[PDB]
Point group: C3
Chain length 231, copies 3
Amino acid sequence: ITGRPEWIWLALGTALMGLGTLYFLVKGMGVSDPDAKKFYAITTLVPAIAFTMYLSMLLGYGLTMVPFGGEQNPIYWARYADWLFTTPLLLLDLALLVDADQGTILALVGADGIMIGTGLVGALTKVYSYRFVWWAISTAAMLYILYVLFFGFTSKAESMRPEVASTFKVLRNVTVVLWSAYPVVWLIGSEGAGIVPLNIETLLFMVLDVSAKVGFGLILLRSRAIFGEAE
Amino acid sequence: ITGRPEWIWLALGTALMGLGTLYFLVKGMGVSDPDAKKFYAITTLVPAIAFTMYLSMLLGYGLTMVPFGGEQNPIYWARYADWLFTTPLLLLDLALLVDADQGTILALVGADGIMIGTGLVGALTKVYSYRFVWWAISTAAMLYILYVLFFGFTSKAESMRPEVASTFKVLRNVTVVLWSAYPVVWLIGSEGAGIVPLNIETLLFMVLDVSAKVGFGLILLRSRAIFGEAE
Amino acid sequence: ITGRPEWIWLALGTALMGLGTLYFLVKGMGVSDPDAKKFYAITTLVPAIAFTMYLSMLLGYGLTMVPFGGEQNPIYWARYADWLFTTPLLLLDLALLVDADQGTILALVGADGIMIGTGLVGALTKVYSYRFVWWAISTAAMLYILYVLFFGFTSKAESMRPEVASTFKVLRNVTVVLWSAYPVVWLIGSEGAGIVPLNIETLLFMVLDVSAKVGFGLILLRSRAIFGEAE
Ligand SMILES: CC(C)CCC[C@@H](C)CCC[C@@H](C)CCC[C@@H](C)CCOC[C@@H](CO)OCC[C@H](C)CCC[C@H](C)CCC[C@H](C)CCCC(C)C
Ligand SMILES: CC(C)CCC[C@@H](C)CCC[C@@H](C)CCC[C@@H](C)CCOC[C@@H](CO)OCC[C@H](C)CCC[C@H](C)CCC[C@H](C)CCCC(C)C
Ligand SMILES: CC(C)CCC[C@@H](C)CCC[C@@H](C)CCC[C@@H](C)CCOC[C@@H](CO)OCC[C@H](C)CCC[C@H](C)CCC[C@H](C)CCCC(C)C
Ligand SMILES: *C/C=C(C)/C=C/C=C(C)/C=C/C1=C(C)CCCC1(C)C
Ligand SMILES: *C/C=C(C)/C=C/C=C(C)/C=C/C1=C(C)CCCC1(C)C
Ligand SMILES: *C/C=C(C)/C=C/C=C(C)/C=C/C1=C(C)CCCC1(C)C
Ligand SMILES: CCCCCCCCCCCCCCC
Ligand SMILES: CCCCCCCCCCCCCC
Ligand SMILES: CCCCCCCCCCCCCC
Ligand SMILES: CCCCCCCCCCCCCC
Ligand SMILES: CCCCCCCCCCCCC
Ligand SMILES: CCCCCCCCCCCCC
Ligand SMILES: CCCCCCCCCCCCC
Ligand SMILES: CCCCCCCCCCC
Ligand SMILES: CCCCCCCCCCC
Ligand SMILES: CCCCCCCCCCC
Ligand SMILES: CCCCCCCCCCC
Ligand SMILES: CCCCCCCCCCC
Ligand SMILES: CCCCCCCCCCC
Ligand SMILES: CCCCCCCCCC
Ligand SMILES: CCCCCCCCCC
Ligand SMILES: CCCCCCCCCC
Ligand SMILES: CCCCCCCCC
Ligand SMILES: CCCCCCCCC
Ligand SMILES: CCCCCCCCC
Ligand SMILES: CCCCCCCC
Ligand SMILES: CCCCCCCC
Ligand SMILES: CCCCCCCC
Ligand SMILES: CCCCCCCC
Ligand SMILES: CCCCCCCC
Ligand SMILES: CCCCCCCC
Ligand SMILES: CCCCCCCC
Ligand SMILES: CCCCCCCC
Ligand SMILES: CCCCCCCC
Ligand SMILES: CCCCCCC
């Protein structure tokens, strides 16, 4: 385990997702409101899944070697298994907040699936130049998601409760900034151009992941917006 | 096929899931009620999926060799492919019975996914001691599911029709007893401590599977609880 | 890339799915109706997914070699990854058109999953004779889907708006004819009996895919049936 310099960030990531999971689980114990239960369910599942996949990376299961550039390159494939489930869940949190129509939810989740799936293919592609073709397609899918979060959702929120509008706005901004960093880290890290070494890359992803999941969740679950308006 | 002593239980399992599938399909032919159609759909799909995966194990496709303990260990991975889809379907049957809120359904299905996914990782893990780490996490996810089935669902059922309350109670009890045996069999069988040989392990899983799927389905689909109250 | 004679059909397929995707995306820009948004979302996702998987086949990622018949046989596994997601989406388009009950939708999607999953197992099976066992099970699942599209849906459509009835009828007929060709092509092509060479097989699948996705989508998205009745 300790033979990989990035182990420390995997261990920290595992611990923080674990602690985040336990905290949200305990916090959601005293919740009977059906709307709030949905948000607690979605939001607690996110670090729970991330916990399992961080642990899989820490223990070495979620790592494979991919030959490109005439080298055996360590690729943590478990990230994509995580993101495949957790990024649509995060989008669902946002979509449910603003009472998105079903068509838009399907568009988001579908685009997200394409984003992660093509990122995975890019990560495992042995022809070096083609890795960036997949990166570009995945990034286009991300750009679509970001467009919808801004020019389909933000104007929907203004027509809703002020607490849901303000909470959505914060979470939207957090999401757009944090999510946009991922293709950059991939591009310059071990999966892409290889300018940033894997240990630093792992640190960067860990900071992004904890912020995008536990940070996000802390903001969401402390908000009154997740409760139905009741007396 | 006959070169594996466990083939007989795989063959029997295949036949019983097949027959179970055909029986539920025929039985559901004369059903127009929209609620009953949901239960027939869910409940017929369960042995249909199990049929395909038993057949895959029988024909040898759903088997791989995993090196641990300095041995090549036969691991039937097809079980997890089965359970990944059939256990949430079984939980959906229960959840729909008691008209569970969406948040609770998501919690159940999500926990179930974690249960099966981590069981799969445990099954394929090459570091012997780590297999039991995954077993423990999976078992914790199972315990969460069982907690919800008792302390989130049972009190919901009492507020519903007597036929749905009584049927849920029976199916809940069947589910908790049968499902709890699976981590025990895994732990002592070829995936875990290796005390019980694979042929007996396969027998045990076959008895559990047929009971948890066809047995469960027979109880559910004979009940009046799957029909909306109509005149 | 050009080393495989079928590359031309993969390239054409990629281009046509890409163009189809862009066309539906642009066309759906000026849509606010919640019902129409659902259909645009579903129908645009279908060629988008197919685009990615055609590209994966073109670049060689979505190809593996399967030993059977004492030969190394090129099997494009990416087709199943495509179909796993796009065929239920296509069925959802049809089901939503006729306002299918949830039980029937689950039956369709479930049968479809079995159809594609067993086709995949058949495609990767190393025992030649067993490949056709999987083909038969998959074809039985297809026959179930076709039965439901005719003897569960058609009589539902007649009870609905004339525009939805007529559009459903056309799309149903297109779907039944086109989908039925797939098991035939598989059976006689490289996955099955090997009578038709892979380059021609790839052409046939490309024509079917573009017709079943872009052709289908063009018919659906030009129809008034995807809009709620409004003044
Ligand atoms: C609505 C939305 C959800 C839509 C989703 C968008 C989605 C279509 C985007 C593309 C997803 C697709 C790329 C997933 C591919 C998974 C693949 C990387 C798994 C690894 O297999 C790749 C090679 C080794 O590199 O296997 C060696 C060859 C082996 C023989 C491989 C054979 C097994 C195949 C992998 C079977 C395909 C199953 C499905 C791809 C499962 C989906 C997995 C998940 C990652 C989407
Ligand atoms: C809401 C709920 C549904 C949440 C679900 C909870 C879920 C997160 C729990 C964990 C699921 C995750 C462990 C699934 C892992 C699948 C993996 C075992 C497949 C086999 O690949 C493992 C190694 C060989 O041992 O592959 C050799 C290396 C290869 C290069 C592997 C690369 C391909 C990757 C497998 C791509 C990942 C795709 C997804 C994991 C598909 C999910 C499969 C299913 C089993 C969940
Ligand atoms: C409600 C509906 C959706 C129901 C769906 C119906 C469905 C049950 C029908 C059967 C699906 C099932 C056959 C999928 C099998 C995927 C499998 C082909 C992936 C490739 O792995 C096969 C072998 C190499 O040939 O791997 C070499 C051995 C490796 C060690 C394999 C270990 C990893 C396993 C693949 C883990 C299983 C994960 C799930 C099968 C993911 C589903 C993938 C998708 C194709 C259904
Ligand atoms: C909790 C984890 C999160 C929120 C991860 C989000 C990941 C992304 C937004 C990844 C995007 C990528 C691209 C846009 C292209 C390059 C490859 C990816 C997958 C890193
Ligand atoms: C129809 C099949 C059923 C109902 C199978 C259920 C399986 C489980 C409840 C399995 C649980 C496991 C654990 C709790 C940890 C050990 C590994 C598993 C996957 C066997
Ligand atoms: C857009 C792609 C479409 C509509 C593909 C549809 C594919 C099928 C209907 C495939 C059916 C098969 C069988 C019925 C058995 C043989 C194997 C398959 C998977 C080709
Ligand atoms: C939950 C059931 C676990 C109990 C399994 C008992 C199996 C006993 C069979 C005898 C064990 C075989 C050892 C000698 C080969
Ligand atoms: C490929 C995995 C996609 C599924 C991710 C799980 C989250 C799905 C959320 C469903 C949103 C509801 C749409 C109507
Ligand atoms: C990883 C596979 C999970 C999907 C299993 C299929 C059953 C899902 C049931 C969905 C329940 C509805 C939730 C609102
Ligand atoms: C194995 C992949 C199955 C999921 C395919 C995605 C489409 C699912 C459509 C869901 C229909 C809604 C059912 C209530
Ligand atoms: C085009 C949609 C406007 C809002 C999205 C902001 C785009 C941020 C660019 C991210 C950079 C990724 C490499
Ligand atoms: C803690 C929830 C109470 C109901 C669940 C019963 C737990 C049964 C233990 C199963 C043993 C698994 C090894
Ligand atoms: C049995 C349902 C009647 C409508 C389905 C038509 C069946 C077409 C046969 C397709 C041939 C596949 C090999
Ligand atoms: C070895 C690198 C070759 C450059 C490939 C860049 C492709 C990026 C695609 C963006 C449209
Ligand atoms: C393929 C990238 C798409 C980003 C621009 C958005 C196009 C308009 C979409 C309107 C729903
Ligand atoms: C070789 C076996 C070593 C013991 C591992 C047991 C781990 C179980 C984890 C329960 C918390
Ligand atoms: C991680 C195992 C959880 C089992 C105990 C239940 C904790 C309380 C959950 C309340 C929804
Ligand atoms: C080598 C071919 C052997 C014939 C197998 C055909 C099986 C088809 C199953 C249809 C019930
Ligand atoms: C297993 C093939 C099934 C095709 C015939 C349909 C049987 C009746 C189903 C009624 C819903
Ligand atoms: C509750 C604390 C969870 C921490 C477990 C994972 C940390 C890795 C330690 C090596
Ligand atoms: C309808 C009977 C189904 C039995 C087929 C599978 C049994 C295995 C026989 C070797
Ligand atoms: C918009 C045009 C998309 C075409 C890209 C794929 C075609 C393959 C060219 C070799
Ligand atoms: C992106 C950083 C999130 C900060 C989380 C703090 C939560 C305090 C309520
Ligand atoms: C767990 C055993 C189930 C027994 C099924 C019998 C069904 C008869 C109605
Ligand atoms: C199966 C062929 C479909 C033809 C599509 C033409 C669409 C024109 C409206
Ligand atoms: C990590 C355990 C949380 C302790 C309770 C915090 C207040 C809800
Ligand atoms: C007005 C909301 C600002 C949130 C920005 C957070 C950036 C990490
Ligand atoms: C809208 C601001 C996005 C900032 C992107 C930063 C990526 C590191
Ligand atoms: C396995 C075939 C079932 C025969 C009909 C049973 C009575 C519905
Ligand atoms: C009162 C219901 C009892 C059911 C127990 C079944 C145990 C297998
Ligand atoms: C509530 C009783 C559970 C019984 C567990 C038995 C496992 C073999
Ligand atoms: C492929 C681009 C489509 C151009 C607009 C067509 C009319 C909606
Ligand atoms: C009456 C609808 C006829 C459609 C047939 C299309 C065959 C490809
Ligand atoms: C209902 C007519 C089906 C035609 C099947 C054609 C397959 C090539
Ligand atoms: C009903 C299909 C069973 C196939 C068994 C072949 C040994």
